[PDB]
Amino acid sequence: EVETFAFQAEIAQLMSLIINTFYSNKEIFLRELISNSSDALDKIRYESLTDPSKLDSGKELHINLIPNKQDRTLTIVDTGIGMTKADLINNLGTIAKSGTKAFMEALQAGADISMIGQFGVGFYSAYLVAEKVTVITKHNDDEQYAWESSAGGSFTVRTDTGEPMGRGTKVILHLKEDQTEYLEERRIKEIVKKHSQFIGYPITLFVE
């Protein structure tokens, strides 16, 4: 049972700009996703202080980076707060509208794509390297969901019947044919060291 949705006009515009603009410094997508993972882990850690039962779906707070050359995927996994169906379909897109407009205007005023995170829309930098993005997420109050988009103005949401993840988010980057350098161990290590060296959670780079 797959539900198909149209992105709000501003988000479809942002995704097109990210796909179409010539911009060589694509590596910045990784810092954006790791930073989102880190914010999600802070959120579950904060909530657990007043309600300890929120860690019943997993005590460990961490980030895994999983490359897979056979599937041509790079997966960012976290055991953070996770997302609800409402976040996936409408809540995040609503907040994204404001950030998208501010980012588009900043670009016209002379800013570059690396500043995307300051506008709360850093997640869409995934499309600098990915032809398709799959998001598997599980929030304590909701079910496990799979969000997916190859851009083109639409995204899908389905109940994920795959392997339960307990609590957290998995961002699966189906890389563009010319972006396989992001499956290489030394390339991932270099980017993490350059942009994500001060994240307060363990980041484990899996090897193939």
Ligand X SMILES: C#CCCCn1c(Cc2cc(OC)c(OC)c(OC)c2Cl)nc2c(N)nc(F)nc21
Nearer Cβ to ligand X (69/164): 164
How would DSSP label each residue in 43-105?
A: HHHHHHHH-GGGGTT-S---EEEEEETTTTEEEEEE-S----HHIIIIIHHHHHHHHHHHHHH
Nearer Cβ to ligand X (44/188): 44
Nearer Cβ to ligand X (96/165): 96
How many beta carbons lie within 10 A of that of residue 14, not counting itself?
25
- Does 97 show up as a binding residue in the annotation? yes
Q: How far is Cα 169 from Cα 177, in angstroms, rounded to an integer?
A: 25
- In the complex, what is the shortest distance from the CB of residue 174 to ligand X, in angstroms, rounded to a whole number? 14
- In the complex, what is the shortest distance from the CB of residue 95 to ligand X, in angstroms, rounded to a whole number? 7
Chain residue at closest Cβ approach to ligand X: 40
- In the complex, what is the shortest distance from the CB of residue 194 to ligand X, in angstroms, rounded to a whole number? 20
Q: How far is Cα 27 from Cα 25, in angstroms, rounded to an integer?
A: 6
> By the criterion CB under 6 A, which residues form the site for ligand X?
36-37, 40, 78, 80-83, 88, 92-93, 96, 120-121, 123, 135, 147, 169
Nearer Cβ to ligand X (133/191): 133
Q: How far is Cα 11 from Cα 153, in angstroms, rounded to an integer?
A: 8
Q: Are residues 101 and 159 in contact, defined by beta-carbon separation less than 8 angstroms?
A: no
- Does 119 show up as a binding residue in the annotation? no
Output the known binding site for ATP: 36, 78, 97, 123
Output the known binding site: 36, 78, 97, 123
